[PDB]
Amino acid sequence: DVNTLTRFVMEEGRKARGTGELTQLLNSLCTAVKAISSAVRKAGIAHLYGIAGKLDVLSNDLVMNMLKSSFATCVLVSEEDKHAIIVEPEKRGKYVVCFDPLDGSSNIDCLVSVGTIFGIYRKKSTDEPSEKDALQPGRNLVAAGYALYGSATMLVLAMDCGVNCFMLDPAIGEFILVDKDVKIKKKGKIYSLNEGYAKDFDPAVTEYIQRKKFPPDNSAPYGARYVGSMVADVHRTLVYGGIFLYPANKKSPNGKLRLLYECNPMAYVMEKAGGMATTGKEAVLDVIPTDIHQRAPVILGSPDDVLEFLKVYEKHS
Template identity: 60%
Template sequence: MIKNKDEATLEDVLQPGKNMVAAGYCMYGSFCELVLSTGNGVHGFTLDPSLGEFIMTHPDIKIPKKGKIYSVNEGNARNWDGPTAKYVEKCKYPKDGSSPKSLRYVGSMVADVHRTLLYGGIFLYPADKKSPNGKLRVLYEVFPMSFLMEQAGGQAFTGKQRALDLVPTNIHERSPIFLGSYDDVEEIKALYAAEGAKA
């Protein structure tokens, strides 16, 4: 929300994500889908070309509490920090006898987060040695997807804090992000907490 209804300022934009009133994305290919939240759940709409209108096809999307998929660019693995490397290792080679998670990575944040939202799991775009502040932009990538994920019952974490608690200082600010199923994000949070306790 802007303070002065007559003129928006930079201060109006640089607010924490928890102040957002709506978020969404549109994805198109063989069909066109709009996913939207105005702060009361997440709903998906599919374009019906014969009507020229979007029809609600996915009411009240709820992400599974735990998923079987992880989504990360493993091409950056040698530059990851300890918690990210440990988490991905655990996804591939679980020590508790459970099945490994499946890697699915399209390289399009919208497509990867959409799949995560519907089927569960976790999307990771960590900071690394090349991009110590992360690569994804807070205001127009991290915040909208984090808002949607929380509205669907998941979590979003930066490696330090809840993503929607970030207070950006510039329009193109970047951040690491881990978002997805509640239990999966809890696991990466625990790894960061353990690393912080060692320091």
């Protein structure tokens, strides 16, 4: 039987006897994602070039306006806004949403895949809504996922029931369930990181990569893939297995990816899919944030590959 994003969420929502607020949020987010996809694919670009005589800004406005008007949110953190957005009182709901409206968009000049990353928390404090409400550890996530605007547009949604993948059918504007309760391979054959920072790597990453290229056990070397777009790289890791690394370097001593709306949502998808996500020192989902734009190093993917990196990381203290 065919299933769609909206029908899937309503079914899970009724089974859990919730109030519907999360369904309203997710439905509003799904609508913004379809509008972002249409813009990312350049529908209407002919009018920009005069047939009748900014993308990440539009993406942010779509998510902001759809999430505000859902009556389901109270605090919104976006990569595009320096401060948390506090939803006006008459529109307030119980959820906190941290999102990257168009991740990878700096390299959109080359038509690199881009994506939207979102993470959903229940507002925890009973204080007046504030930026502090977004500073919860990833263990607290209620839902998380991403839309990948790749060769096709896919929405990956992770909840307590697990990870489900929905493909956008643009002929009808509906998200179709195509992969149910997805699990990552126990061990992969691809590693993914920007090897241009090889001069700045800590000894543990340098050694782990060496093992991938020159395995001591005479197994075949791993292949390398690195799109430079986190959603594309994490999604390939999810689909094919393997490992994705973005560790700290001299330009980024606390790492480069954002904890709140890049690392946590991806770590949540990984863990619900049976994978792993670590900073080297701890689980990404256990980091307690202090700043809404704070960065984190990240190594994630198949459990055997992350565990192997951790053994090497422990070798070097």
